[PDB]
Amino acid sequence: YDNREIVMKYIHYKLSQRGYEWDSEVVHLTLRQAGDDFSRRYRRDFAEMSSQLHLTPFTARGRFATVVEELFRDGVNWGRIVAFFEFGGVMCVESVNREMSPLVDNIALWMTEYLNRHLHTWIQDNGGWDAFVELYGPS
């Protein structure tokens, strides 16, 4: 329910910063800023989809899985879910920069269910989604 919408607007927003755009709102806003604080630690002393991989329409599900596994290999926290959202965004903007985009909808359904099935359980334990805003809100 919730997680489908949260992915929608977060991907929505990640298009804007690359001169692009395609198809309780305090959650969506805080997560948008968290990904910005996160990304200007990234692109600060890094580079963008520059440390990239070889992304085809057929390997994207493999690289998504490899990265997402290793991201949560040893626990789940809020800072890593922001990375999970940031990574999912890095997928979509590398797509249009590499001439794919209906992949985005796949990536969008590669983040929702993963929250629904394997992340939903940890979310409600540490206070639900409204716990994320309480810890990253007035900051």
Partner: protein
């Protein structure tokens, strides 16, 4: 506050250059100078971080203690994750070295794409783990 973060920014900045996987980098990756350097910047990051939790434990004066045998234990483990990510980054480049050594110095693209996969996963988890900390180093201090 902004010094273990600077040492971390020096670890990430160096890793950033290894993520370029340049001809320069690949030649370097067959030596032990890149993994030796990573341990230094990591052992510096953990040093500045360990000395900064102690620095807080001094001016940290409110001391509600029924939950602080839970507080500091949550953060002594949340720094345990940061040193873990930085150890993993180092190991992922030891495996790359030992893998090309079994290819007589040669290196396939299947290997470099796989290494780039792990480096991205680690950069993300590194930054995210450092984020879950710097916020938890403001519930400690405030």
């Amino acid at each position: 506050g902004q010094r273990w973060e600077l040492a971390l920014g020096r670890f990430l900045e160096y890793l950033s250059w290894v993520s370029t996987l340049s001809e320069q980098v690949q030649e370097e990756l067959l030596s032990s100078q890149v993994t030796q350097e990573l341990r230094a910047l990591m052992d510096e990051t953990m040093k500045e971080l360990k000395a900064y939790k102690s620095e807080l434990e001094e001016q940290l004066t409110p001391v509600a203690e029924e939950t602080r045998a839970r507080l500091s234990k949550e953060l002594q483990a949340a720094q345990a994750r940061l040193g873990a990510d930085m150890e993993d980054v180092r190991g992922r480049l030891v495996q790359y070295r030992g893998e090309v050594q079994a290819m007589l110095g040669q290196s396939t693209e299947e290997l470099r794409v796989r290494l780039a996969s792990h480096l991205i996963a680690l950069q993300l988890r590194l930054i995210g783990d450092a984020f879950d900390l710097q916020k938890r180093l403001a519930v400690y201090q405030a």
